[PDB]
Design a protein around this ligand. Structure first.
Ligand SMILES: *[C@@H]1O[C@H](CO)[C@@H](O[C@@H]2O[C@H](CO)[C@@H](O[C@@H]3O[C@H](CO[C@H]4O[C@H](CO)[C@@H](O)[C@H](O[C@H]5O[C@H](CO)[C@@H](O)[C@H](O)[C@@H]5O)[C@@H]4O)[C@@H](O)[C@H](O[C@H]4O[C@H](CO)[C@@H](O)[C@H](O)[C@@H]4O[C@H]4O[C@H](CO)[C@@H](O)[C@H](O)[C@@H]4O)[C@@H]3O)[C@H](O)[C@H]2NC(C)=O)[C@H](O)[C@H]1NC(C)=O
Ligand SMILES: *[C@@H]1O[C@H](CO)[C@@H](O[C@@H]2O[C@H](CO)[C@@H](O[C@@H]3O[C@H](CO[C@H]4O[C@H](CO)[C@@H](O)[C@H](O[C@H]5O[C@H](CO)[C@@H](O)[C@H](O)[C@@H]5O)[C@@H]4O)[C@@H](O)[C@H](O[C@H]4O[C@H](CO)[C@@H](O)[C@H](O)[C@@H]4O[C@H]4O[C@H](CO)[C@@H](O)[C@H](O)[C@@H]4O)[C@@H]3O)[C@H](O)[C@H]2NC(C)=O)[C@H](O)[C@H]1NC(C)=O
Ligand SMILES: *[C@@H]1O[C@H](CO)[C@@H](O[C@@H]2O[C@H](CO)[C@@H](O[C@@H]3O[C@H](CO[C@H]4O[C@H](CO)[C@@H](O)[C@H](O[C@H]5O[C@H](CO)[C@@H](O)[C@H](O)[C@@H]5O)[C@@H]4O)[C@@H](O)[C@H](O[C@H]4O[C@H](CO)[C@@H](O)[C@H](O)[C@@H]4O[C@H]4O[C@H](CO)[C@@H](O)[C@H](O)[C@@H]4O)[C@@H]3O)[C@H](O)[C@H]2NC(C)=O)[C@H](O)[C@H]1NC(C)=O
Ligand SMILES: *[C@@H]1O[C@H](CO)[C@@H](O[C@@H]2O[C@H](CO)[C@@H](O[C@@H]3O[C@H](CO[C@H]4O[C@H](CO)[C@@H](O)[C@H](O[C@H]5O[C@H](CO)[C@@H](O)[C@H](O)[C@@H]5O)[C@@H]4O)[C@@H](O)[C@H](O[C@H]4O[C@H](CO)[C@@H](O)[C@H](O)[C@@H]4O[C@H]4O[C@H](CO)[C@@H](O)[C@H](O)[C@@H]4O)[C@@H]3O)[C@H](O)[C@H]2NC(C)=O)[C@H](O)[C@H]1NC(C)=O
Ligand SMILES: *[C@@H]1O[C@H](CO)[C@@H](O[C@@H]2O[C@H](CO)[C@@H](O)[C@H](O)[C@H]2NC(C)=O)[C@H](O)[C@H]1NC(C)=O
Ligand SMILES: *[C@@H]1O[C@H](CO)[C@@H](O[C@@H]2O[C@H](CO)[C@@H](O)[C@H](O)[C@H]2NC(C)=O)[C@H](O)[C@H]1NC(C)=O
Ligand SMILES: *[C@@H]1O[C@H](CO)[C@@H](O[C@@H]2O[C@H](CO)[C@@H](O)[C@H](O)[C@H]2NC(C)=O)[C@H](O)[C@H]1NC(C)=O
Ligand SMILES: *[C@@H]1O[C@H](CO)[C@@H](O[C@@H]2O[C@H](CO)[C@@H](O)[C@H](O)[C@H]2NC(C)=O)[C@H](O)[C@H]1NC(C)=O
Ligand SMILES: *[C@@H]1O[C@H](CO)[C@@H](O)[C@H](O)[C@H]1NC(C)=O
Ligand SMILES: *[C@@H]1O[C@H](CO)[C@@H](O)[C@H](O)[C@H]1NC(C)=O
Ligand SMILES: *[C@@H]1O[C@H](CO)[C@@H](O)[C@H](O)[C@H]1NC(C)=O
Ligand SMILES: [Ca+2]
Ligand SMILES: [Ca+2]
Ligand SMILES: [Ca+2]
Ligand SMILES: [Ca+2]
Lengths: 387, 387, 387, 387
């Protein structure tokens, strides 16, 4: 019954289109939730889309000023992958920061809400609140904003608390059926860890996070489910996946330290290793969240100084808006597949023709077959949309 | 198969956020039922939200004059906890007063509708009408407006018939698979019992009710599911839970009689005992349904005169609107958890910029862990909402 | 697995409120189907509501001229009892005349559509067309517009083909798993048989129909499931149940023939026997479909002269609009319960304030307990409703 | 658990009405997806309707110029047959060309999206992306736009890549649990094959496709599942089924070569054999997609030159708009039934009073019983609908 993820990783030549919600285009006519920070997590049968709602729909007076990150009205929305967030969507918890797990038996939802300086993380398993923890650093308590990983019934979630531009207290929480059985402080050379994209790498869990303080390379967290040991490093690929960053010719990376190159900010992204190579996704624009591309870097997991990429796919065209991206793993007949979602942010603080901020999602899954090219942007025309 | 509730009560240090519907905020764009008197009740798998609809949506001509409590068009709406009352919501019965039960096998709905002087209580178990009873006092027959409790197949419901300002005929009905197998009149020191927040306290059921006549101290009712024996008293804490009430310094309780302190009105509320202590919720405002706080009174269940607060939590900010609150119990892996919901009333008779009266809910569940602070109001701005 | 209906009839002292959809009231804000001729049928777990949609919602340009009975766009809508016919409602077949069956294993739908003089009846069982029959009299082929009855896997449906103002070819069709295994021409003294309300009277099926030709007393069709025998008579009760009819002073019934009293025209209605007594429902208004009452006539199933009324209930107030009414049976724990629905027609012809014709439904179920009084009309204000 | 379709073909005397969508009529009030190229597939329990959405609803600013066939926002929508494509509809994949299969265990969705010259076909089985293939001719890679057929766990899909007017590369793909196990190049005497309407003809699969280059007669692809052999021919029927075509008096067929009679364009249609006879459907207009008729041709499957017709049914009236039509097979108790759908296109490039292009569907199933006449058009009044 419990998921162990003991199958090997599927061979990947690239990624094929999997799902698209068209949320903003459907919002022009119809009642669609205002969302941001989405992710995808699958039970053994089907996949689900999650998002942090803003307590309002897009064609709504309350969609004004929905660029704010933390409000009391934010809830975690949960639909089947493909079903857009309409008025029949279930909100499973109060959360302006979220992470969701299926251990093979039931869903685990990790939900953070409340005051910025005194925040509660609620742990809801099988529809019941099982445990809760208060912010330890008395700062903005935040979690992965993506799917977490359960192996043998033990789910791991990464939680950060403290300064976003300085030393912060990151904890790895071990949850069994909604109950916190252990809490390990982050160890290793990753100095700043935030919004980890975690995937099962049996016998443990590997997380690729964002360094929001001093690195454009992505921190790596390796979690051993049995021993509970934590080790930290950075993605060694010379092509860094964080935005902002330097250009490919000028960007540099380090196997153990942040590269100190346009690292003061960041975006949620993902990466996974295929032997010594790394499969990564990032925004095409080096400074803004415009476009999205995925590629494989040869020896990009074991060698800094490697800027040799291949199998590049354009997910979102460079002229179109992207946002958070994360990984999620789907068990196959014989192997574990790696899939990723891209959040397509539209609205305020970058497009001022509307008063709201919302997102769409495009989902791609790894394939061992062949694929073509294309681009799958949000596609809404905000000049004609209600304000 | 039949829920017994024989597990002990979970150790509670407070309550963690559980659910929020944002009903009024979603009403501004989208078709949402006009509801009042909500409550939460869970089958052994997931929790459900209930409310008494007004036969209309909010952006509707029929949402005017919806402050009225008893209309022929009121129905009991039932969704999964989290799903807002959209047009796909199932109205399970006709009722302007309702109570719902799950005994572990099927749902029991107690639904009261009809003429105020001659009302019918229909008992629907497993989707069928199994029994019905007429008013005995030929006055407004009313029930809990919250979850009832079923132990070993037998569900107990408190029903009141008579004046809200003088002796009323309160009966406890024992229902097995929808059939009324016993009816016992209320006996004990509580003289006005209405809208009882009942919870399982094995081997019995304990209800904390509203005295609309002479009390600010909430009445208590204890049912022996075995001897169909009913005992009545009041809550002993010197910090009373009813609204209106006196200051915290000037208030008193007797917990064998009403305190005769500003007791000429009331609001549905909850309290449960933790040894000699009492966990209780109330409005922060002593005169109006503004704000909501929960706290634990030291020896507040046994010592009239205890006013020692601890573990206070602000659920709704004092400036924000609250309403009915009630308790519901969720079975855990080793203990029984106590959770509560707060109805957030918005609209007429207190906010005259709209013509409708409706509510959202916020749900909190007892936690043995830690939590922070916050406030989770309705959040809808009625100045911009359709009138 | 197959339903036999072998239990006796539950002792009925009257009827208690069961369900109310508030369709027209919710139509003012929200997308609700335009329907007419509804009915209720239940599978061994839930009750479903059916209606003949007009291919449009109420707030729609196509709701104009929805007073037409037979259009190519009419489909049979099927929702759970309580869920209003919103946009997510499933239309199970094309039909402007319908009847639905659950034999304990799967749903049977008898759907009539096509030309008025060459109508086609489709038989859909378990989601599949199993059989089809053409109109045999080349006039409006019609069926019960209510639930049909299956015993031991054999469902029986009453179909009429011919004129509404004279003799018509009424046939009784025996259907097994969607397949017509036998077709019996109507036999007996009933001269015009239409829109039968059938209930299981084990070992057979009893149908109370309307005479649209020469009688205000309701015809009876007795169907033997074992022998496929058909027997026809009239409800003997001197208080006739059809509309139009004579006043209670001048009503007469023959118990074998139509009474020749305002018998032209009619409304779909219901009746069932309780020993020698009859439980029947009818419009309060003798000439119009205004109001609804249910009562019991003492010795009304055997004595053509009995006018002794008792146990009268007002379902819809005298000034409010009723419509079609029909019976459906629910298997209880020890007996078979009889329930009835009343269609609440609103709109064109009678109410010229709107351009559409639609309906709401109110459902009552038999009870052995006590009950009060009340009135549950449609309750929509058509002066403010969109036209 | 795997569907073998081993039962004989049902004796068919004609077709009976099964399902109607009314999508465009419901679009006037209510949020309904803009769709085109629909089809029907059934699992062992019930039937589902599929359509290629345009990423927008009809009463939407993005509904403008929805006449384009390939956009990044097009997705495959999936509801149960009878549920209109409302906002709760699940889009199961990104596709502007699609084909869907149920093999008895799980759904297989074949979805093509991306650039015109480098389109990607994604193979999604049981909710997971299993395989993927790129365009082989670097042109518009397209598939059946109807249900594919699975036998003994092996599903077969016909894929065309290349010129729409000229020789193109057609491949038959054998898919097992989402994985492409074999790929067969089209062989036989058919020169242009597109949008095949395939049905199980045990022990193989037979497809009736459209010749878009040189023929108004329809090509036939016979697929042997046992040994993956492909043979091709045309339909001998002197009454050809493609639109445009010549009139009945001047048409002809060869069933080894295209008839070279107004074969420059085409429409997706269906045919199946009844011994030596053929049941086919086509537009009543020989040059436009107006009306729809079905009939049987005596010796039409084995004799070019036959023009003898029987059992003609008008599905859509001659002056009403039709579109794509395809076949789907339903397993009965003892026989395999052949059913078909007709797409009712409304909107741009033929009706200029609206800016959108969308469709409704009507479904008919084969019957061994009797049936009447009728016409079941889309029925929306576009002069009154929003742009
Ligand atoms: C139909 O779809 C398929 C799949 O989507 C497309 O095929 C894919 O095409 C992409 C290129 O469009 C292949 O990407 C790989 O690109 C590597 C470099 O990427 C470039 O883009 C990034 C953008 O950020 C730039 O930074 C890079 O530029 C910098 O670095 C390069 C280094 O060379 C410098 O040249 C630049 O000046 C910049 O400084 C690039 O612009 C590329 O290196 C990679 O590798 C091929 O070439 C190397 C070296 O020559 C070979 O060693 C290697 O084996 C590859 O060549 C093989 O494969 C190709 C394709 O089969 C054959 O033609 C060769 O003969 C040889 O066998 C590669 O180009 C991606 O790999 C490829 N995917 C697949 C699955 O093949 C099709 O284009 C598309 N067709 C259409 C639209 O018509
Ligand atoms: C981050 O989150 C946590 C969790 O939410 C928060 O910690 C909680 O803080 C509240 C403070 O409200 C603690 O609640 C308890 O409040 C009791 C008094 O309630 C007061 O408010 C109501 C309305 O405002 C008034 O009616 C009462 O006033 C009456 O009585 C006071 C008496 O002082 C009079 O001043 C008034 O005039 C009225 O007559 C109160 O004002 C309070 O009594 C209770 O107990 C603490 O204080 C007493 C008395 O000194 C101590 O005996 C007792 O031990 C408690 O003090 C602490 O003791 C130890 C210290 O190590 C620890 O056990 C705790 O720290 C404990 O607080 C108490 O104040 C609630 O208990 C607490 N929840 C926890 C820790 O679980 C944090 O505030 C929040 N932080 C930030 C940064 O926002
Ligand atoms: C609280 O709710 C309960 C439950 O809903 C209500 O009680 C029910 O009340 C109704 C009406 O009072 C009872 O229905 C029966 O009505 C029969 C006549 O119906 C009348 O309405 C129809 C339509 O308008 C008219 O056509 C009739 O008029 C014609 O007939 C009468 C006589 O038949 C003529 O006088 C007229 O000129 C017309 O020709 C009526 O207006 C009624 O006959 C029936 O019988 C009771 O009364 C007769 C005469 O006394 C007795 O012989 C018979 O045995 C019945 O008496 C019973 O009831 C009393 C108490 O009710 C007991 O003490 C006796 O033991 C005996 O059981 C009856 O009136 C319906 O029966 C009743 N249901 C119950 C009790 O379950 C309450 O009224 C309501 N109270 C409120 C609103 O406060
Ligand atoms: C109630 O519903 C039922 C069922 O839906 C309807 O019955 C069906 O009616 C249709 C139409 O009559 C029957 O279809 C058959 O049509 C054949 C060809 O149809 C014609 O239309 C097409 C297109 O419009 C034309 O192409 C045809 O060819 C003509 O035009 C070309 C031009 O190039 C000329 O060259 C031709 O010469 C034609 O002029 C036709 O106009 C038709 O061939 C077929 O034939 C019957 O009659 C022939 C000759 O008389 C017999 O050989 C053959 O066996 C058929 O006879 C049987 O059926 C009739 C009718 O049932 C019986 O009377 C006979 O006893 C015998 O059983 C035929 O007409 C369709 O078969 C029929 N479906 C049934 C019965 O299941 C009812 O009409 C409808 N009733 C209403 C509206 O009241
Ligand atoms: C990456 O994105 C930024 C836009 O986000 C582009 O820079 C802008 O260029 C336009 C003119 O084309 C100016 O009006 C804006 O002020 C610029 N900056 C911003 C932050 O808006 C930039 O050209 C893009 N290209 C790359 C590859 O850096
Ligand atoms: C709480 O309520 C009591 C009783 O109403 C208040 O006591 C009154 O206080 C005022 C001003 O101090 C005096 O003039 C009155 O004589 C007091 N008695 C009465 C019966 O009114 C007390 O002030 C209130 N305190 C708070 C915390 O608001
Ligand atoms: C409890 O709530 C009432 C409102 O229901 C408060 O009364 C208001 O007080 C404010 C500020 O003093 C005035 O501006 C309003 O006009 C008052 N409203 C009315 C009519 O009462 C009351 O002050 C609150 N009490 C406490 C202790 O906060
Ligand atoms: C069917 O098609 C044929 C051929 O297209 C038509 O025959 C032509 O009719 C026109 C008059 O309209 C003549 O001028 C041509 O010479 C004819 N051509 C042939 C091939 O003879 C025929 O009229 C059409 N018939 C129907 C019933 O539409
Ligand atoms: C109550 O029911 C539970 C079912 O989980 C059972 O384990 C327990 O032993 C029962 N206790 C009593 C008092 O019957
Ligand atoms: C129903 O089935 C039983 C056998 O299961 C049989 O004895 C009985 O006669 C059947 N009833 C009818 C009415 O056909
Ligand atoms: C096809 O499936 C049915 C049901 O499983 C089975 O009875 C039949 O033998 C099968 N035929 C073949 C060819 O396997
Ligand atoms: Ca950074
Ligand atoms: Ca009181
Ligand atoms: Ca009549
Ligand atoms: Ca052609």
């Amino acid at each position: 019954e419990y998921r162990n993820w003991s199958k090997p990783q599927c061979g990947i030549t690239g990624f094929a289109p999997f799902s698209k919600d068209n949320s903003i285009r459907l919002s022009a006519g119809g009642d669609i939730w205002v969302t941001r920070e989405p992710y995808v997590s699958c039970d053994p049968d089907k996949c689900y889309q999650f998002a942090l709602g803003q307590g309002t729909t897009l064609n709504n007076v309350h969609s004004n000023n929905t660029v704010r990150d933390r409000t009391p009205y934010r809830t975690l929305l949960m639909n089947e992958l493909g079903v857009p967030f309409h008025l029949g969507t279930k909100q499973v918890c109060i959360a302006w920061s979220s992470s969701s797990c299926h251990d093979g038996k039931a869903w685990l939802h990790v939900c953070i809400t409340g005051d910025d300086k005194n925040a509660t993380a609620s742990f809801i398993y099988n529809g019941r609140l099982v445990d809760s923890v208060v912010s330890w650093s008395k700062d903005i308590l935040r979690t992965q904003e993506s799917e977490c990983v359960c192996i043998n019934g033990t789910c791991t979630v990464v939680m950060t608390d403290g300064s976003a531009s300085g030393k912060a207290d990151t904890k790895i929480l071990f949850i069994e059926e909604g109950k916190i059985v252990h809490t390990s402080t982050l160890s290793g050379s990753a100095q700043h860890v935030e919004e980890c994209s975690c995937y099962p790498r049996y016998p443990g869990v590997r997380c690729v996070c964002r360094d929001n303080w001093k690195g454009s390379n992505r921190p790596i967290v390796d979690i051993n489910i049995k021993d509970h040991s934590i080790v930290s490093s950075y993605v060694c690929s010379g092509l860094v996946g964080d935005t902002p960053r330097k250009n490919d010719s000028s960007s540099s990376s380090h196997c153990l330290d942040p590269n100190n190159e346009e690292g003061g900010h960041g975006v949620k992204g993902w990466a996974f290793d295929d032997g010594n190579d790394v499969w990564m996704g990032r925004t095409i624009n080096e400074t803004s969240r415009l476009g999205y591309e995925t590629f494989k870097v040869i020896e990009g997991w074991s060698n800094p100084k490697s800027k040799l990429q291949t199998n590049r796919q354009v997910i979102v065209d460079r002229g179109d808006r992207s946002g958070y991206s994360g990984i999620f793993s789907v068990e196959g007949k014989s192997c574990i597949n790696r899939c990723f979602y891209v959040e397509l942010i539209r609205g305020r603080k970058e497009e001022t023709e509307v008063l709201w901020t919302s997102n769409s999602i495009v989902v791609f899954c790894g394939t061992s077959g062949t694929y073509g090219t294309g681009s799958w942007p949000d596609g809404a025309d905000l000049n004609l949309m209600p304000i």
